[PDB]
Structure formats: C-alpha cells, structure tokens
Design a protein around this nucleic acid. Sequence first.
RNA 1: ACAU
DNA 2: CGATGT
Length: 136
Amino acid sequence: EEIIWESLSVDVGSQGNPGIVEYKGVDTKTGEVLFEREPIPIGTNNMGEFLAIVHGLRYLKERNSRKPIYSDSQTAIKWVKDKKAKSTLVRNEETALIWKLVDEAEEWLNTHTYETPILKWQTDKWGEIKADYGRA
RNA sequence: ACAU
DNA sequence: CGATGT
Ligand SMILES: [Cl-]
Ligand SMILES: [Cl-]
Ligand SMILES: [Cl-]
Ligand SMILES: [Mg+2]
Ligand SMILES: [Mg+2]
Ligand SMILES: [Rb+]
Ligand SMILES: [Rb+]
Ligand SMILES: [Rb+]
Ligand SMILES: [Rb+]
Ligand SMILES: [Rb+]
Ligand SMILES: [Rb+]
C-alpha cells in the first residue's frame, strides 16, 4: 500500500450519468494536467473511465514511457484487461459519438501492444485520485 | 457486497 | 436520493 508517485492518474467527470462525459490524465506526483478530452454530449461513467485509461496507454506509448496508470474504476480496469467495454448504454443517434470512441479504443487495444501496469487507486487508504473532478 |  | 458496472 505505497503510492507509486512516478505514474499517470486518470478520471472521468460527468454531468449526469448517463450524461455529459469528459476525462483527464494528470501526473500523480505534481497534479499537472497532461491531457483532457473535450466533453462528449452523452455517455456513462464507465465508458469515460475506460476511454481515460486507453487514452493514457496511447499517451504513454507515444512518449516511450513505462510509467503505470492509476484508475479508481474497478469496471474500467477490467474492461481494458478484457479489451472489451461491456456497456449497457443504448446505441442510437444520441449516443453515436461515445460509442464511436469506445469502438475505436477497443480497436486500438486489439492492434497495439503495451506493458503499462494498470493499477487500482486505493481511495479508501489514499483519498481521492489526483485526476478527480471535485464533483462527487 | 465491491468500485465508481 | 438517482445512475453505471462486476
Ligand atoms: Cl477517447
Ligand atoms: Cl508498477
Ligand atoms: Cl480493480
Ligand atoms: Mg473515477
Ligand atoms: Mg472522480
Ligand atoms: Rb512507441
Ligand atoms: Rb468528483
Ligand atoms: Rb469526487
Ligand atoms: Rb471514487
Ligand atoms: Rb455509493
Ligand atoms: Rb448497484
């Protein structure tokens, strides 16, 4: 139960669930924001958490970085491990964008390799993840 | 129950 | 209190 400070932390934020979804990744040690996705009009918490991890994998791979990724989402960690986002969200015209991004993230996982450890952020011991959106 |  | 997920 030691934080690995040399890591990337990601989190989703939303207005509603389902609702408007965004996500970001930060340097765990410094809090510096390294990437932020423009808000998506309709998605779920778990789809955003999944996209955040996959974006982190792509970000670190492009920069030849072996740092681990922290996420507080038990669901999204499993989905990334499985390379499959098992979302219940309806696929229709309103949800087309989030589903396109999820499909593309799965596609990336199936066509690329990575060694990045994907670690559970232990909120119960460490407080809220550094990438959190102070919204609850 | 657990994580969000 | 409501939701998404294992
Ligand atoms: Cl994305
Ligand atoms: Cl590690
Ligand atoms: Cl986990
Ligand atoms: Mg989270
Ligand atoms: Mg959060
Ligand atoms: Rb590379
Ligand atoms: Rb929050
Ligand atoms: Rb929060
Ligand atoms: Rb949390
Ligand atoms: Rb809760
Ligand atoms: Rb539940």
